[PDB]
Symmetry: D2
Subunit: 390 residues, 4 copies
């Protein structure tokens, strides 16, 4: 009966779209967190048996190799297999689940899960360039916005959040208060130095610039800042604004996992063990509540209940769906995203699931809790959830 | 001890670059094979618990959702989770492995693995479009060629094949004979109707595409030998004739836990015995199958001689000949009905579609064990072993 | 002494179809070809040319910003000669000839070349967001050929402008389709009787396949019937439309050039001119009715020449659309037998910036063939203009 | 003997590449100067008989119609013919010459010559987009740089300037001193308000922004700013830098001309009359000295000599060729570009010839001089020159 343990977890600070990480490609963001995660774990790259990375937006040809490039350039041996996965907003946690699966099934004893996303460097496509437009204006397709639209109905993820706000009765006022609180919690967490340990600096080159602070957060935010904003996604009876929706963002993160008995052998104290995970599909139009069935599956499989959870990282894609999720599961809002989430810290799509796992495990240790839940909604109508035990 | 069994497998015919499938997006290719695979299995889309699809080249925004779009539009329930994976040339077999893993770990009893790729519809990128080029000529980046270049050294997969031909002593004459044979085998197989069952027609009065159009039915050895090396200036062996084509296709298999299939009274095509992954030198990616296959054999408690049918993707005759030599495979059993050189190499779909080929061939000859394996750009290999019935 | 401009030679390429025989030949090379061959036909050295003006609307590559200079120098004109590119849209090619003539009339030089070159096959797409970035949201690749064919004030196709003029001047669908059929018939007859043989310079492309020579106007339909026209649907408007692909001009590639010189400089050289320039005229009209631009322009030219319509033996009046071409002849009271007697834009094609030069070449050779006295060349111009010139043999 | 007189001249301030005019299309720049030139002349747009505009870089489809769009949107009647011309760097002065020709030959009594260029909004082309690239990386072609490369030899204009510096013995030290002086002269001229009258504000839209000062000029320039710069255009033995070459720039300008007897009829006091013009072709590799033969032609045709000239606007494309031109013609440097030129104020290609005509005529009136020369070199190997007299 094999068990997966997490031995280290690290992330970059989360850059804003067009911001501090604009000039750093996903491959380099991924290699950075891989190298630093291995160092933190005191594990040689020669001993890694599998690498899985999450990523949604291919920014360049190397991104088709992202898992391999982040692995090898981060010092993982060329003898290790390397995968890239795409479950959209869930990709980062999927990477960690896929990597854990290779350990559980005995394929290897040591693996790395992570994610990297650069929404700053998202490309435009030219779909007529290969075979020609012949006659008539042609398109340059924004592939970032592509990621943010449902593939069946071609609506923005934000209008899907309006559907969820409607169905679960989450008011504008509730969304804006949740958004304000996320910024307040994030700001408090940055100032109290909660993120210091888990963040790897990115340094670029008067002199050297080092980016190590989550730059999306608004430290001086007020409720009127929220309430003055206009709905962006829908024309009538709208509630979702730029202020109470997640940002567009750059980041990466990675965790090193290994089989329980490997960690013991090496004398490594784990951050936590993986208890269970769950996946769900839901209506594409209501993708924001994906976490509800996924979390229930993970709880069931763990033999746990909501009250058992000490720390919850449930990505704030939009305050609309985030409020719906906590209401529907009956979560205590004080335990959910205690240090902020997508609205305040940002939502770097394919990295997010890996980076909020990193947050959850460091927070779990900080408060000496027992159980952590990590869960997020997924574009196209899905949810993913995992539960960890310290 | 849960066991994964394959209950159906289907593929499109393989289109040529700029050819019969030029106007059909990966999403639609994927939905087609998903629908038809489920029908063949006599399984309702309502009963599918996971879907994983392989794909390397994003041709449009929907391709970021490919697994989910191919699932739902193929009649899988919205309640099923859906994943897209990318292990380059191995993506299609990886999808089948990831889907099987969800069964093996008890996450579900019914899953679909597949792949879809449209190299015809591979985009150009404009990386300066968002923030501007400002001054000076800018690039439109061919993302198909992007897929075919090593990400460390920026060399074509084909120069990697030259390295392998050099290291394992595979001559130009070998490679051209192997290429000619692949075409001959593929042609024979098409004419004898071996592929008829496994191929789902794509219909666009109508044109209906159901025959693998890359194959050259009239090929001669002088066709090969007159060709010039394409990938290296000097001392080259690898040509357009003895390298794999650029191609469009999809494929999908429906898998379920052994006891599910029994419950349903379904006769499986085969069971999954084992799989193996390896990394290798990026510069010698073509021999990735060798360590991967050895891992799979070890895990299965098998040896080479146990294998009745082998699908080992011909990315280039150079590496394909090296793989069979290094493993000591019998060339008669390897790619008996052609492979990437003759049928084509639709990157992300290939691993799923040669699994489909392997299983139908295994049943045709009433063999016991099948190996599916392929080399992977960037220096990897992936292999799986199946057993009939 | 009062100076006079005479045309001593005129040549054109055959007119290629969009995506057709001239797809792989840039304007610069089309221009250099007609310059070289015009000079040869005139028996004039490139060393003796004092000015070159070329018409061109669509810039296909960076060299096209230099077109007049590149066509001049690569055609064997001395580097010492000034060289100009002009753009009056559909009129550019006649404007080039007018501007070149003006340099002679004002005594700036004694020898000049007017021409035009256009490759609508090689028209580019623009990316206007590329330089400074789109930032967020889908961006555009702008089809600059279609750009040339839309009015800059109202962003309507030239063809909807032709619908306006069909409406105002009462030119019926039936009239337009008959005019279109007749243009093809006239063009076909002219090609077969060899009328164009002398004026056409072959374009020969050498390649890994040996030599290909293009010397026949490939837009013309030699087997056209009236039911070919009548079965077509209106393309430019979605109610009450009359203008179709069949009775509108084609999209086309071509070049042409004429060598002009002061009357006394031809006599000196013992050259027999094709014709002299008598007068020219320019007009502006409503952009929405641009097709009738020729009417006021032609009246100005006739006035300045002290002539009337009955004096004209040959008329090249570009068929941009049968709709406006019929309106122009009706409004001026022209005799349809004398107007575009060997076809025009509908049948032979409309290579925008070259067209005015190439129908001047047609007019002067036809004038000589029938031993007429006076030729009128005129055409409508996008954005609401006309241009006209009158020549005497 | 019909005579052409200039009754008004106006320009925009010259914007820098990516600068204050980055969001204003050539069509709008052109319409603005047309409207304001007509107002200054006290002439109705209904009375204009011809419009000609210079432009080299098509930035959008409307730029194929530029003359017509600048005319009509500037309030010129739709009944007026309208032309766009391209003689590269000379286009602006060519537009004024072509317009004057329509008057001289009796086609009309009132015409407008101008130029407009937006190098900020120069496009990228995608030449594979129409018919397809098929396989392999494809190009986005920078059309601004396209304008700045010779079409025979595909060398930058700047390497052509190195050839001229070499042939006419103009040292790095000479070029840098000339560059510094151009900035000093421009700065002095801006501060003393010399340009105030001729400049039409561009006001665009956190409320309204008004641009009315030539923003390329460096008011604090020193010689060690020049001398620290490295040659940009050639590998070895280079003298031409970013500091002593002209800028990339946006602008427009226009002048209203009419037949002498029309102006008298209207009781308008002209700025000047056109005396003569001249065109020359030269070696493409030495295009920078185009002005020399063109100016000699214009002087000959006018029956004038160099000493007759009180004000000279001879575009500084590069200090290398600008110094060569003045040396070869034996011009007095004090009279040449007395208030700066392309190095300091900028070089908005297709507008430049119009806008330095505007400068020349206003300067000629300011100093109560008699004769002005306007001349500039032209890419591909040409020159153009015109001479004006203040009556």
């Amino acid at each position: 009966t094999r068990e997966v343990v997490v031995v280290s977890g690290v992330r970059t600070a989360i850059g804003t779209f067009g911001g501090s990480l604009k000039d750093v490609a996903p491959a380099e963001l991924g290699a950075l967190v891989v190298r630093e995660a291995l160092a933190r774990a005191q594990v040689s790259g020669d001993d890694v048996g599998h690498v899985v990375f999450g990523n949604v937006i291919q920014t360049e040809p190397r991104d088709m190799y992202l898992g391999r490039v982040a692995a090898v350039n981060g010092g993982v041996t060329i003898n290790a297999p390397a995968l890239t996965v795409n479950r959209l907003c869930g990709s980062g946690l999927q990477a960690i689940v896929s990597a854990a699966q290779t350990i559980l099934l005995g394929d290897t004893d040591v693996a790395i899960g992570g994610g990297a996303e650069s929404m700053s460097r998202a490309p435009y496509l030219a779909p007529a360039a290969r075979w020609g437009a012949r006659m008539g204006d042609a398109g340059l397709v924004d592939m970032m916005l592509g990621a943010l639209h449902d593939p069946f109905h071609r609506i923005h993820m934000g209008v899907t959040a309006e559907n969820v706000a409607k169905e679960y009765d989450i008011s504008r006022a509730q969304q804006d208060e949740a958004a304000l609180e996320s910024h307040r919690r994030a700001s408090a967490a940055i100032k109290a130095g909660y993120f210091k340990d888990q963040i790897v600096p990115v340094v670029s080159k008067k002199g050297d610039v080092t980016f190590d602070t989550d730059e999306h957060v608004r430290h001086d935010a007020t409720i009127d800042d929220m309430t003055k904003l206009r709905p962006v996604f829908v024309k009538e009876n709208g509630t979702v604004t730029a202020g109470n929706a997640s940002g567009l963002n750059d980041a990466a993160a990675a965790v090193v996992m290994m089989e329980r008995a490997e960690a013991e052998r090496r004398g490594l104290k784990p951050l936590a063990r993986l208890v269970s995970y769950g996946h769900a599909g839901v209506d594409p139009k209501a993708m924001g509540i994906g976490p509800v069935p996924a979390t229930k599956i993970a709880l069931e499989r763990a033999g746990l209940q909501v009250s058992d959870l000490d720390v919850i990282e449930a990505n704030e894609a939009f305050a609309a769906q985030a409020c719906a999720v906590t209401k529907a599961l009956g979560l205590d809002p004080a335990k959910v995203n205690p240090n902020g989430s997508g609205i305040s810290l940002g939502h770097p799509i394919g990295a997010t699931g890996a980076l909020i796992t990193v947050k959850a495990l460091h927070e779990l240790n900080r408060v000496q809790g027992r159980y952590a839940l990590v869960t997020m909604c997924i574009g196209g109508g899905q949810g993913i959830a995992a539960i960890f035990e310290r």
